[PDB]
Symmetry: C3
Subunit: 186 residues, 3 copies
């Protein structure tokens, strides 16, 4: 039989109040707190914390302060990653981010979700679906990414967009819901 952590990672229904998960979420908030309390000139310190927090980190990385995570280890990031002010990463499942990806302020990537049915939801069962972002992607400010979304290479997501469906590579996409408005040279 699977553990609650295993059900979680596999996109199945799990109980978040599982002791192991609660204490993993505690460990995450400790590093998060340490990260957000650092001083503006403590780049070395922040970088170390990110390497303990995230599942995988490239050579260079810059995440502006007040970062929000659930577990940290489900966050996998490529080279030269940039995340601006107040980004939220609900990494119940894998948030896999490619190379040269930069996040504007207030970008929210949610992998978690709840049952539509109230009785199921009120029971405490919960789900996750991994999010994928390709190489060379600029994500605008206040963009929301929903569970199970894949974003291709060479994509520019306009500010305030709500990504509900997959966005193909080599496109510009804006809106609520988020749709392609332009193609671009590869």
């Amino acid at each position: 039989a699977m553990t609650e952590k295993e059900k979680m990672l596999s996109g199945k229904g799990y109980y978040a109040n599982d002791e192991l998960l609660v204490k993993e979420r505690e460990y995450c908030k400790k590093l998060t707190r340490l990260f957000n309390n650092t001083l503006e000139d403590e780049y070395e310190k922040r970088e170390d914390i990110l390497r303990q927090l995230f599942g995988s980190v490239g050579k260079q990385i810059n995440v502006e302060q007040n970062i929000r995570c659930d577990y940290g280890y489900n966050i996998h990031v490529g080279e030269n990653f940039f995340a601006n002010y107040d980004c939220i990463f609900l990494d119940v499942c894998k948030i896999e981010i490619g190379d040269n990806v930069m996040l504007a302020p207030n970008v929210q990537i949610y992998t978690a979700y709840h049952p539509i049915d109230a009785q199921l939801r009120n029971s405490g069962i919960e789900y996750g679906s991994p999010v994928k972002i390709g190489d060379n992607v600029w994500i605008g400010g206040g963009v929301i990414i929903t569970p199970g979304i894949t974003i291709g290479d060479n994509v520019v997501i306009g500010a305030g967009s709500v990504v509900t469906k997959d966005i193909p590579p080599n496109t510009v996409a804006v809106g609520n819901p988020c749709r392609v408005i332009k193609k671009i040279e590869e």
Copy 2:
């Protein structure tokens, strides 16, 4: 004659810089600060603070850190309430929330508003309209609730939604503006 606090609660025009209201807003920020400075394993402490902050609290409650309120006492919450990261409650008027309601990160419930006319607005007069959320409601990430909105039981509001009109029970509602897209079994 009514006091400014009374005008506020009754949905009438009031001056926010009223001495009583300013010092009530100060008291609110003190508890808010205490709440947001707690350590990740201080559940007992956070729970106590919420019972001093909110108008009414159920048996169990979990609000993730960095909460934003104006007064606190206008916030009335039911059983098993959950509020994720960085929720904002502008409780100029009553924010009444039912049982088994869970808020995703960055949910913003605003009850306050200003006069459309500039001269009225520049005079400092201000208004409020209470917000109502029924039992068994899942509110998505980055959802904004406008003043005077009532949300029925069994409602799922999709992420990034902007609730401008009332949402009937037993529905799924998304978008900007927020509209019903599905009905659901009761």
Copy 3:
């Protein structure tokens, strides 16, 4: 030849990792940190910090806590300015705000942007376009303002709006994208 700071202010392409700009961004975060760590009854202190932070400040000003800026000096604000909880000012270029303007919580004003082309973007080059807000303007909660936007006098921007095009004076504007829905008496 122009410096990187000069290219920035002039709307041209610049490298943000320029030593002068990095240390100006450090100075900004120091004041920001001091501002956000103040206690709820330290109005005098916050006001002083804002006068060191912002390019220009009127007689009276109230900015609620957790403010986010990049440089500060590009932010020019008029009389009786109000900014509520968690506003973000990406002032790569000039953010010029008129008199009697009030910002609701979570208002995000972005002047910065990146090249559409990935190779240009991955090179580290970056741009800015100034944002202008007229006198007597109420900006709703969670409103996003994109680079190069001018907002006229007597304008009410509804909550959750995403301003992508210029908004004429004497109008009410909502939506994603943000459009005029009403005219109003001057």
